[PDB]
Amino acid sequence: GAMAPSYRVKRMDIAKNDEECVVNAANPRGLPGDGVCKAVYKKWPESFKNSATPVGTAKTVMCGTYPVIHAVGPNFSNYTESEGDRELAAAYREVAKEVTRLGVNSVAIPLLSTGVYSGGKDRLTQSLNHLFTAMDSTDADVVIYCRDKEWEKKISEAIQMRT
Ligand SMILES: Cc1cc(C)c2c(=O)[nH]n(C)c2n1
Numbered sequence: 153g154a155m156a157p158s159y160r161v162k163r164m165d166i167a168k169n170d171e172e173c174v175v176n177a178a179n180p181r182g183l184p185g186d187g188v189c190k191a192v193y194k195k196w197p198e199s200f201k202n203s204a205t206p207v208g209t210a211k212t213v214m215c216g217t218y219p220v221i222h223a224v225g226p227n228f229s230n231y232t233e234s235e236g237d238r239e240l241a242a243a244y245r246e247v248a249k250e251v252t253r254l255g256v257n258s259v260a261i262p263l264l265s266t267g268v269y270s271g272g273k274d275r276l277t278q279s280l281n282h283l284f285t286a287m288d289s290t291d292a293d294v295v296i297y298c299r300d301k302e303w304e305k306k307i308s309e310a311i312q313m314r315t
């Protein structure tokens with residue numbers, strides 16, 4: 153575990169992370185997809201061997217010895233708010249299990265279901281809180297990656313408000 157487990161946020165490509173493993177915002181079919189998923193596919197294509205996994209689950213595949221945790225958030229275009237909320241919480245719980253199992257001291261994580269799976273809604277708070285609920289009991293350093301400047305400020309504020 154990390155000596156003083158922390159949360160941090162960076163505004164940059166998660167494919168350039170400085171952590172011991174990465175969480176992919178995957179599709180259920182293990183397809184290269186778009187957004188975070190496509191950047192992960194370009195950086196760690198080997199990790200997409202038998203990466204397909206259901207909504208609300210996480211499946212880890214090694215690129216060399218570097219773990220890629222394929223976490224499948226719900227597409228809120230397809231799910232009800234209620235069911236999508238449940239699956240989004242579940243995907244993060246499965247990430248917490250994988251991070252623990254791997255014995256990593258740090259993990260790079262995007263906000264699941266906040267991009268093309270958001271159903272055209274701002275889910276920063278919903279997704280971040282489910283991330284916290286899952287990861288708070290882990291001792292890995294968590295580094296959240298985002299691309300939007302205002303999202304960076306809002307994530308940084310939400311982290312600092314609990315410290
Ligand atoms: C909306 C979005 C798109 C891309 C391409 C990335 C990325 O490479 N890292 N993050 C968190 C991203 N978020």
Ligand SMILES: [Cl-]
Pocket residue numbers: 163164165168
């Ligand atoms: Cl970048």
Ligand SMILES: [Cl-]
Pocket residue numbers: 177264265266267268269270
């Ligand atoms: Cl997404």
Ligand SMILES: [Cl-]
Pocket residue numbers: 298299300303
């Ligand atoms: Cl973002």
